[PDB]
Write a protein that binds this DNA or RNA. Structure first.
Lengths: 63, 141, 117
RNA sequence: GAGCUGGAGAUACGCUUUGACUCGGGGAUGUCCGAAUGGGGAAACCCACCUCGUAAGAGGUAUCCGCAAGGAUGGGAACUCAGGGAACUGAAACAUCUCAGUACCUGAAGGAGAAGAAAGAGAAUUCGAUUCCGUUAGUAGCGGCGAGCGAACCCGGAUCAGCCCAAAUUCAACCCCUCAAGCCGAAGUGGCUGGAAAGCUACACCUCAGAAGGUGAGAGUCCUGUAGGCGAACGAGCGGUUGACUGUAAGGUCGUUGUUCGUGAAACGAUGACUGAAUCCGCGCGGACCACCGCGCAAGGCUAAAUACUCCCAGUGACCGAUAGCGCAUAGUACCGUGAGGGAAAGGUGAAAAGAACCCCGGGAGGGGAGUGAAAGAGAACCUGAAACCGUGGACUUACAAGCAGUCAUGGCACCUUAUGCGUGUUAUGGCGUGCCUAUUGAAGCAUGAGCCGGCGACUUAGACCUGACGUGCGAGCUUAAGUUGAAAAACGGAGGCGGAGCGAAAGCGAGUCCGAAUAGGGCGGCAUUAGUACGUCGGGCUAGACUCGAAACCAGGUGAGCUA
RNA sequence: UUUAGGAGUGAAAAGCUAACCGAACCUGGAGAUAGCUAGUUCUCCCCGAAAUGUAUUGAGGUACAGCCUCGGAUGUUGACC
RNA sequence: GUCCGGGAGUGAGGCUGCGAGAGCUAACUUCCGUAGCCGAGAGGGAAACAACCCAGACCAUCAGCUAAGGUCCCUAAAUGA
RNA sequence: AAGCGAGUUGUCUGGUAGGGGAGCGUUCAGUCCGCGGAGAAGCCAUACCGGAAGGAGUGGUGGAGCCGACUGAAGUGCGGAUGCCGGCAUGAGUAACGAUAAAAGAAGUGAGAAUCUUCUUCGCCGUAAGGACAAGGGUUCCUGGGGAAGGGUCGUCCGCCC
RNA sequence: GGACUCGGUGAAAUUGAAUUGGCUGUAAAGAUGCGGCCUACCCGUAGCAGGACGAAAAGACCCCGUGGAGCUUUACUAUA
């Protein structure tokens, strides 16, 4: 019995193997976006640090 | 007989290692406050952490239906001395014969030998390997 | 499964009731004033055969203090007379022995008394 | 079978060996109530009115459907639905929600009803009759977008069987075959401590049949089972050929319930008022619609077999032990009482009572002699029988000495289960010294819990819920469902998922990768690289109350208002 | 003798339904659930703390990190001078 | 010097030193950090008494010395200069 | 053939939530040649050893079995949860015998008699604490009979019990 | 008429345990077992309240408790 929380079963979930796990960086986007130009090139699996223990109950059985 | 011994037929043969541990039963030995009685331990049901935060925030990206992801045949010990047991039917050792969802190609290059395969694939990965190893073209679907 | 320990928990109480000594009333087969009085007999009882030195210490500091004052005597400000012989070292027990022969400080007086100059 | 009908086993009374004594099956006297129903109608109780008849008293009275008789309705512990419908909880509170359609009410029949042969599932341009679990998918979706519920795509077997509204069943002979009374069923003993010892010892016999057990000490030659097989009158019961019968006449809109779908970006069950069109190469939908395909055709049901159930009859399990286990090892006695509704506590003498004549105090209860008793420190409220409290004496100390208690400390009376100036049963007194549990920063407290005895004494149990130590299986790895065997099994078994190059929203890409105008960067096959995995006890956690208990409050049903009115 | 439960009675007190009704009792729905709090059983060898910060309709609630034990590790990087 | 992990605790302390904050520089009141201490170990000194001077232990010996504390007594130790 | 250390130096600190780790033993199960009649298991007590828990020497008594090493399983173990029942408690022999609305005695009896019985004297109620009908208890009333127990003394009185 | 002579019956609320005198002091400061000092021949019963932080339900006055119930108001809102 495991539900796998589908929401945060989307986003980053894919596993790596024998190195480091992914994440999501997430900036602000949306409106008034007329400035900045760096994270503009930095968005996807923005690694957090190591807090990927919570997320597991999100999914971990036949993706 | 039975003067100064104790056994009479082995089974007494112990072992050379172990396996179990110490176990616990929760709430034991006549002591210990242990853990927090407030909700936890019993029932709980929802996870033993915070809640449903930092799950929210992302705009969410759909497309997760089965569709297709394929696997691989590793490509390394197949195009050498391997002759005939790898058609798209008899090859069922690492889940290959399982039809429907494609197997593409994906191989390296160079190639100093050759083999034969009931291919049913034309990926752009093994472009550096699709003839060097050998085995027609024939597109299927 | 099952056990029924309605008899085995007898020798337990007794295995410690060993100290059913002369306590009070009938604290030898009590069942109150036993497994409690035992917890009472559970104190410095642990260190009641070493710490006792302090008690019998209260012996040789009345005798060794100034017994035969008919010499000079001082004990305290005299111990520097003890460790003033060739190989003094040793001390008590020999005080317990001092309770026997009084000639334990005849020619063992002024044989340390002015053993300075 | 020949003897005597259940516990105050009842003395007696009475019957025997062609049917007393117990009984197997087909029947019968069958009291008030139960549907019972003549009426009354508060179970054990009062009335009319017709048939009968020596003046007395005998045959009977109530509703529903082919209706003019009759046939049926009764009470039910778990199996399907249907009318059926909240709710404490969770989301750390909190109206959509989880519980769910669950508690309860009411209707049905068999011990089988329920879906089950169709305007169908799937999807490569395949496949037929329901359900269950096996595996997937614990995926898609759902969703105060929150916990959460959760198919179809590929899988096993029981089963891979026909027909129904307008152009088979009923009595019986025979029967593989079940049901209680019941029939036989095996094979040697002596001596001791002693209750005959099956313990010491001795030898043969019985063998497809050697599980539990009774007779004072565990017995194959004392005996009931087990292997070998039998039993009628009555009937069912799973029946096999056949005799009396005849085996082939509605989509839709708007408001919504369900379905996984909280309902909206979606057809599909159906309802509240409106539309009864199509009408055959016409018609139902592939998740709204366009185009093409796929399959099925208004129109009514039967389908036994398995899935899920557990009142009874043999047999079977690493449980309890008669406050243990259901409350019942013969009581849910009496009852608690305002009412439906709540209930005990309690077992045991040895094989067997042989539970006992005979003189005493005494009213007797209770106690003497002495047999009984192998053994009466079982003992006619009875095994062994530990204990706070409680019964007496004694070797020793003690009121003139102070602290719940303490341990040692010289003495002090006793003893010497080894003269060995050495110890056993101890005390005036000395250092001083404040208890335990245990929610406490915190005390030694007056902070609280505690008179004691006997037990209950809880994070575990099923779950591929997961991670991880060790031992092992393998390096190309490991298996579910039960089908065959069947007092173990088991190989057979790729349903199947996890490991697996990855990244990417994904597409798709690619041994390398999202950026776009792209040697400079984070992850990866990569890599000075484990590519592993299954079983078990086990670190935390998890789906559940599942660490237990202590709350007034919300509900369904039901019970009297003789309490105040 | 009907009235009854979320109604009746009622001289209103917010009194009563059977010795407590701020909405009867009993069988039943779930143990109301519980961060409250009592407790959670035989005897142990070597090691070891927070009331500091960030979070909170969040406070003696709880999360995590410095803070403990253990498997592996860090071939010169330690702190003192 | 050097991280990955199975699992904690229970978040609400006290005091002397170091200085302020609310403050008749008052309060084992209250906020803060910094050494220690008691929440997890006993004593001498301190009359006995959590942070104060000295000192934290393997069980047993009526064996020795150091620091504090004392050198008149009730219970140690020169009314020695 | 499951790993073990003296010789030695620091650590061997004391430890509250915790980590790695050993066991005493009872019930279930394996192998039972077995252990017990001189009688074990049930229990009562004696200075051997053990890290503690505990294992040991013997009788006592008791009556039929019982545990063992190698092993896994089990509701495996606080006296202590103001718990619950069962029993012993102590408040302690005191307060109290009930509405303070008088009684003495002769005599029957016998086990002694103060509260029975045959009875002269006293007094409280007598719109009562009379008798019948109402509900109720169902066995009250009698021929009477016995103390185990009850009537909160007890008793030769009951409407206890036959 | 109860408190005292005598015959029988004698329970409950509660509670760790009494070689159970006091000061002044000390202690989370309300100490009798602690400090230091003084003091009593031990016991029985009548009687009395200062005494154990007297007893009973773990204050129910209050606060904390993302407790409940109860009533009202146009509180958000269902609804005959």
């Amino acid at each position: 019995p495991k539900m796998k929380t589908h929401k945060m079963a989307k986003r980053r979930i894919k596993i790596t193997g024998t190195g480091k796990v992914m994440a999501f960086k997430s900036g602000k986007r949306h409106q008034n976006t007329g400035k900045s130009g760096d994270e503009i090139r930095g968005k996807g699996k923005g690694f957090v640090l190591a807090k990927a223990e919570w997320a597991r109950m999100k999914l971990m059985l036949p993706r | 007989h039975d003067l100064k011994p104790t056994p009479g037929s082995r089974k007494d043969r112990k072992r050379v290692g172990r396996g179990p541990g110490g176990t616990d039963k929760t709430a034991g030995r006549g002591h210990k406050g242990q853990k927090s009685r407030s909700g936890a331990g019993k029932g709980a049901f929802f996870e033993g952490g915070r809640s449903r935060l930092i799950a929210r925030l992302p705009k969410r990206g759909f497309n997760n239906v089965g569709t297709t992801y394929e696997v691989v045949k590793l490509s390394q010990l197949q195009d050498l001395e391997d002759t005939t047991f790898d058609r798209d039917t008899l090859e069922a050792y690492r889940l290959v014969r399982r039809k429907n969802r494609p197997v593409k190609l994906l191989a390296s290059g160079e190639i100093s030998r050759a083999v034969t395969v009931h291919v049913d694939a034309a990926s752009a990965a093994a472009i550096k390997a699709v003839e060097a190893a050998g085995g027609r073209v024939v597109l299927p679907e | 499964p099952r056990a029924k320990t309605g008899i085995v928990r007898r020798r337990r109480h007794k295995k410690v009731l060993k100290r059913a000594k002369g306590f009070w009333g009938s604290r030898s087969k009590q069942y109150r004033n036993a497994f409690q009085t035992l917890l009472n007999a559970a104190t410095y009882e642990y260190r009641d055969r070493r710490n006792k030195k302090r008690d019998f210490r209260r012996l040789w500091i009345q005798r060794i203090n100034a017994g035969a004052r008919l010499h000079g005597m001082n004990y305290s400000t005299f111990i520097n007379g003890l460790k003033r012989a060739n190989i003094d070292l040793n001390r008590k027990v020999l005080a317990d022995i001092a309770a026997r022969e009084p000639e334990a400080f005849k020619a063992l007086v002024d044989a340390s008394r002015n053993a300075r100059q």
